[PDB]
């Protein structure tokens, strides 16, 4: 009851606080690759999701 965000005429809107270090500890959970590689320096597009 009314903690999920409200639905407009067609839409549903949110305003969220974004920090760049959350992308870093996102990649630390996701990228669990082998030895020779290394994660990128730029941010990945699966962080706004």
């Amino acid at each position: 009851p009314e903690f999920l965000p409200a639905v407009a005429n067609g839409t549903a809107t949110l305003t969220v606080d974004w920090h760049p270090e959350r992308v870093a500890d996102h990649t630390g959970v996701t990228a669990t690759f082998g030895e020779p590689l290394a994660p990128s320096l730029t941010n990945v597009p699966d962080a706004l999701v």
Binding site: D25, G28, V29, T32
Partner: protein
């Protein structure tokens, strides 16, 4: 109890050390070296 979510952000397995000890005693598969040498499970493991 309250900060289990923010604690489990980091740890991949979950830090149950004594069952790992039972596993190594009974010759069961062991957690791998990266998941042992990460800090959130190492720095309590050496203290224990």
């Amino acid at each position: 109890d309250p900060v289990t979510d923010e604690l489990i952000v980091v740890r991949p397995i979950g830090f149950e050390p004594l069952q790992w000890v039972r596993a190594l005693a009974a010759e069961d598969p062991v957690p791998s070296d990266k998941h042992l040498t990460s800090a959130a499970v190492s720095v309590p493991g050496v203290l224990l």
